[PDB]
């Protein structure tokens, strides 16, 4: 078999890295207690939330 | 009566939502200005209409 490149290892590492990104996003979501932490999660939702926060204050 | 009819008009012209005035009648039955819809489904024209009459 080909030993110069472990092709299964590369794919598993790719999947693991994206899983780690997802779990980090979920961990930050848990820690903040807020669904929309950064921009891009829901732009319209974030804008509406900011407007309603101003209205509430 | 005048003093507490004035604030009735105040609620009518100021009852608001996310940059939408509600009780002015913009979402009435015969209103032409705009129409209010709720997309309550996951595909195509799965919408619904909600009517709010004038309250001035």
PDB file of C-alpha atoms in Angstrom, chain B residues 13-45:
ATOM      1  CA  UNK B  13     -50.134  56.964  17.004  1.00  0.00           C
ATOM      2  CA  UNK B  14     -47.287  55.532  19.120  1.00  0.00           C
ATOM      3  CA  UNK B  15     -48.093  51.857  19.757  1.00  0.00           C
ATOM      4  CA  UNK B  16     -45.132  50.492  17.841  1.00  0.00           C
ATOM      5  CA  UNK B  17     -43.084  47.377  17.103  1.00  0.00           C
ATOM      6  CA  UNK B  18     -39.798  46.859  15.227  1.00  0.00           C
ATOM      7  CA  UNK B  19     -40.064  50.049  13.129  1.00  0.00           C
ATOM      8  CA  UNK B  20     -43.769  49.398  12.502  1.00  0.00           C
ATOM      9  CA  UNK B  21     -46.728  51.373  13.821  1.00  0.00           C
ATOM     10  CA  UNK B  22     -49.550  48.928  14.488  1.00  0.00           C
ATOM     11  CA  UNK B  23     -52.786  50.654  15.504  1.00  0.00           C
ATOM     12  CA  UNK B  24     -52.763  53.378  12.831  1.00  0.00           C
ATOM     13  CA  UNK B  25     -54.606  50.968  10.531  1.00  0.00           C
ATOM     14  CA  UNK B  26     -51.797  50.167   8.094  1.00  0.00           C
ATOM     15  CA  UNK B  27     -52.720  46.479   8.496  1.00  0.00           C
ATOM     16  CA  UNK B  28     -56.497  46.939   8.382  1.00  0.00           C
ATOM     17  CA  UNK B  29     -58.902  45.092   6.084  1.00  0.00           C
ATOM     18  CA  UNK B  30     -59.239  47.776   3.407  1.00  0.00           C
ATOM     19  CA  UNK B  31     -55.796  49.268   4.014  1.00  0.00           C
ATOM     20  CA  UNK B  32     -53.724  49.982   0.906  1.00  0.00           C
ATOM     21  CA  UNK B  33     -50.480  51.140   2.549  1.00  0.00           C
ATOM     22  CA  UNK B  34     -49.177  47.691   3.501  1.00  0.00           C
ATOM     23  CA  UNK B  35     -50.096  44.106   4.343  1.00  0.00           C
ATOM     24  CA  UNK B  36     -48.893  41.965   7.249  1.00  0.00           C
ATOM     25  CA  UNK B  37     -48.018  38.311   6.679  1.00  0.00           C
ATOM     26  CA  UNK B  38     -46.580  35.458   8.748  1.00  0.00           C
ATOM     27  CA  UNK B  39     -44.572  32.763   6.964  1.00  0.00           C
ATOM     28  CA  UNK B  40     -45.534  29.783   9.113  1.00  0.00           C
ATOM     29  CA  UNK B  41     -44.321  27.030   6.783  1.00  0.00           C
ATOM     30  CA  UNK B  42     -41.101  25.638   5.309  1.00  0.00           C
ATOM     31  CA  UNK B  43     -41.867  25.918   1.572  1.00  0.00           C
ATOM     32  CA  UNK B  44     -43.395  28.383  -0.904  1.00  0.00           C
ATOM     33  CA  UNK B  45     -46.701  30.144  -0.192  1.00  0.00           C
TER      34      UNK B  45
END
